[PDB]
Amino acid sequence: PRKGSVPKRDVLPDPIHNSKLVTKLINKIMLDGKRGTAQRILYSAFDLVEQRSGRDALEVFEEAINNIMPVLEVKARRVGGSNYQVPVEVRPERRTTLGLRWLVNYARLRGEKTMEDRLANEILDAANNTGGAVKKREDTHKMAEANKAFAHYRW
Amino acid sequence: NIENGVAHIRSTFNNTIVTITDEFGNALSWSSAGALGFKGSKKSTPFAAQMASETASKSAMEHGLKTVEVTVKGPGPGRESAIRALQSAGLEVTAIRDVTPVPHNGCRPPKRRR
RNA sequence: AACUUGAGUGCAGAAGAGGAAAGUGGAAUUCCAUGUGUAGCGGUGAAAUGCGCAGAGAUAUGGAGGAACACCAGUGGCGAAGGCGACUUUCUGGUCUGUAACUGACGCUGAUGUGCGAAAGCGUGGGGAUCAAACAGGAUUAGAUACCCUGGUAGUCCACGCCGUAAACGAUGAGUGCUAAGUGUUAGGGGGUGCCCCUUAGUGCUGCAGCUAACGCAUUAAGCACUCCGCCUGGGGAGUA
RNA sequence: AAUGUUCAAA
RNA sequence: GCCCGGAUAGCUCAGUCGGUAGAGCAGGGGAUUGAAAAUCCCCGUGUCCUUGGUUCGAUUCCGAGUCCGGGCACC
RNA sequence: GCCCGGAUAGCUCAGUCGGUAGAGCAGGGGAUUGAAAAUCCCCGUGUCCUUGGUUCGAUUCCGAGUCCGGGCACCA
Ligand SMILES: [Mg+2]
Ligand SMILES: [Mg+2]
Numbered sequence: 233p234r235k236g237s238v239p240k241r242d243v244l245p246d247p248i249h250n251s252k253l254v255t256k257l258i259n260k261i262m263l264d265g266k267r268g269t270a271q272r273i274l275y276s277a278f279d280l281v282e283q284r285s286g287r288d289a290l291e292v293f294e295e296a297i298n299n300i301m302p303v304l305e306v307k308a309r310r311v312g313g314s315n316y317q318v319p320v321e322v323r324p325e326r327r328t329t330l331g332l333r334w335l336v337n338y339a340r341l342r343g344e345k346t347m348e349d350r351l352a353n354e355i356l357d358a359a360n361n362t363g364g365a366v367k368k369r370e371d372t373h374k375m376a377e378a379n380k381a382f383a384h385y386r387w
Numbered sequence: 388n389i390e391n392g393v394a395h396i397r398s399t400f401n402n403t404i405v406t407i408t409d410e411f412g413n414a415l416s417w418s419s420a421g422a423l424g425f426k427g428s429k430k431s432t433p434f435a436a437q438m439a440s441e442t443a444s445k446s447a448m449e450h451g452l453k454t455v456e457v458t459v460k461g462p463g464p465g466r467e468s469a470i471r472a473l474q475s476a477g478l479e480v481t482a483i484r485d486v487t488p489v490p491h492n493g494c495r496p497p498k499r500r501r
Numbered sequence: 502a503a504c505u506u507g508a509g510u511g512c513a514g515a516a517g518a519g520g521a522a523a524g525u526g527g528a529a530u531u532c533c534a535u536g537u538g539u540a541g542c543g544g545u546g547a548a549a550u551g552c553g554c555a556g557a558g559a560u561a562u563g564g565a566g567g568a569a570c571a572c573c574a575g576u577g578g579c580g581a582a583g584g585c586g587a588c589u590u591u592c593u594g595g596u597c598u599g600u601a602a603c604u605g606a607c608g609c610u611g612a613u614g615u616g617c618g619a620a621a622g623c624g625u626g627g628g629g630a631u632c633a634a635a636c637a638g639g640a641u642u643a644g645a646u647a648c649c650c651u652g653g654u655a656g657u658c659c660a661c662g663c664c665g666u667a668a669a670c671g672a673u674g675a676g677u678g679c680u681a682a683g684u685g686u687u688a689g690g691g692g693g694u695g696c697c698c699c700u701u702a703g704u705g706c707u708g709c710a711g712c713u714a715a716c717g718c719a720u721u722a723a724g725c726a727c728u729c730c731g732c733c734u735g736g737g738g739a740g741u742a
Numbered sequence: 743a744a745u746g747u748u749c750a751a752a
Numbered sequence: 753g754c755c756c757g758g759a760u761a762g763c764u765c766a767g768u769c770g771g772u773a774g775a776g777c778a779g780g781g782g783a784u785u786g787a788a789a790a791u792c793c794c795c796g797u798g799u800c801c802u803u804g805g806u807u808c809g810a811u812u813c814c815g816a817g818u819c820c821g822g823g824c825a826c827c
Numbered sequence: 828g829c830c831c832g833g834a835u836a837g838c839u840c841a842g843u844c845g846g847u848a849g850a851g852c853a854g855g856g857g858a859u860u861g862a863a864a865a866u867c868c869c870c871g872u873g874u875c876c877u878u879g880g881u882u883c884g885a886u887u888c889c890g891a892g893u894c895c896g897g898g899c900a901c902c903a
């Protein structure tokens with residue numbers, strides 16, 4: 233949109249967990265319009281955290297997003313008559329929305345033969361490090377943080 | 388080796404050189420972008436200057452002098468980020484000099500690029 | 502026969518990178534000498550060929566050698582044109598202003614000849630620092646004999662002697678008179694109060710009248726008149742036999 | 743500061 | 753009349769020292785994109801020159817053999 | 828017939844003085860961008876030549892061993 237700033241206006245309340253930031257990852261596991269099979273699986277994948285981890289999934293959950301939380305972006309920009317990359321630090325509204333995809337994309341990759349148990353091994357083993365998806369955020373975390381380049385670029 | 392130094396830097400478009408010495412010209416520890424692994428035209432960034440003045444300046448280890456008194460050879464893109472970042476090793480810059488060799492129409496230059 | 506306005510000679514002053522011949526100096530590039538030092542410099546879109554521990558590039562001093570003279574410098578000046586720009590001396594041409602003392606038309610243009618004539622090229626010499634055809638090596642593309650990079654011979658430099666061409670271009674021959682005005686600038690000369698207006702000579706812009714196919718030229722004419730010489734007559738074939 | 747060729751017949 | 757080199761995808765070369773066949777140019781079919789050329793995939797058939805013998809087995813070692821390149825060439 | 832050097836990611840080298848394995852070229856997957864080449868991330872398997880012994884422990888010290896590079900080579 234060359235015209236500026238389409239409004240956001242999205243709402244996300246929740247029944248029991250009392251968190252806006254938990255009804256987001258119900259809105260990404262839900263494929264094919266079936267909200268009627270999401271929280272039946274999601275809340276049966278959080279009540280099995282305390283039977284697998286040491287604690288309730290609430291105080292593990294902000295840690296689980298906190299360690300997976302991506303820092304730096306590399307949005308390529310052909311500067312001034314050249315062509316190579318530039319590091320951009322993400323504005324804080326965008327970064328959780330970039331962040332939550334790595335739970336679900338690797339939820340469909342861990343061959344535990346039960347999706348409400350295969351997916352929940354990345355909230356366990358996410359507050360604790362070296363999980364499944366932390367490898368990508370450390371792979372791209374050093375993408376241009378160590379590879380610092382022309383950092384006076386606009387976009 | 389005792390507490391003195393004049394700073395000789397140059398910065399062409401390739402491999403901005405920093406070399407700090409005493410009142411004579413004796414070579415404490417030279418430093419470049421080339422000792423660091425910058426080859427693909429990151430030989431000259433201000434970030435290449437950011438690890439230029441550091442690794443020569445901090446590599447004193449015999450003098451650690453009182454001032455630096457920079458002499459700026461090489462008109463190029465790595466000038467002032469090698470003199471601000473020279474202070475980051477704690478050496479108290481207090482007077483700068485700019486010496487680039489200006490001819491008086493001596494020898495005819497090489498031809499124009501295309 | 503005479504006269505003086507055309508052109509000359511005298512007098513005062515005024516400028517100027519006009520030329521030719523010696524001499525002096527500074528910045529810079531490169532290559533030798535030695536200090537300190539060690540892992541790369543240099544290179545492009547990106548990279549390599551090339552140089553490097555046997556001691557590089559960056560830097561300190563010193564030496565040698567050649568080329569050109571940053572700042573002033575500017576629609577600035579000078580020459581017929583090409584062109585000429587560090588500084589001093591020796592020789593020497595040309596033009597401008599004012600002045601009226603002479604000479605009394607001595608002038609204009611030029612067919613053939615006679616001379617000057619950038620840059621490359623050639624002959625016999627010297628000189629060789631940077632550049633730099635041919636060529637050599639590395640990338641680029643399908644191939645690249647090219648544009649890019651690292652080197653490098655002629656040449657580029659001076660004296661003597663040829664060659665005699667160019668977009669040698671305001672693409673506008675030379676000379677002399679005449680027709681609105683503004684506006685900068687350079688070298689003078691008079692008038693009035695570091696300042697204000699009179700004219701001469703060049704040199705930039707904007708502009709009526711007029712010509713012009715139109716763009717535009719317009720007191721430095723492509724306007725209005727005269728005098729003499731050079732040249733064209735559709736394009737290719739061809740500035741060739 | 744690019745690496746990019748061509749378009750059968752009026 | 754004499755000694756060697758060998759006939760190795762349709763083109764050019766490779767190992768081819770008896771169990772042990774490779775590349776690149778070409779061809780075809782997709783993709784590209786206004787249309788060709790480039791450019792990128794995916795493919796195949798080789799011939800191991802005629803023929804016999806030492807042959808567990810010869811593209812491979814002998815020679816009954818065709819063709820051509822290297823020296824022959826003498827008083 | 829004799830003395831040494833050793834077989835160290837698929838390629839090349841490094842320490843490898845008994846507790847103590849590294850680089851770069853290659854490969855794969857992302858990004859780039861009309862498409863390749865560049866270019867930038869993120870990765871892995873090494874082999875410490877066959878084998879025994881001094882072995883708390885040998886890539887590491889001996890030698891039963893294969894291969895190749897440096898000298899052998901004398902007046903048979
Ligand atoms: Mg708008
Ligand atoms: Mg000559």
Ligand SMILES: [Mg+2]
Nearest residue numbers: 498633650651
């Ligand atoms: Mg060249």
Ligand SMILES: [Mg+2]
Nearest residue numbers: 583619669670
């Ligand atoms: Mg001219």
Ligand SMILES: [Mg+2]
Nearest residue numbers: 671673705721
């Ligand atoms: Mg004119």
Ligand SMILES: [Mg+2]
Nearest residue numbers: 735736737738
């Ligand atoms: Mg004709």
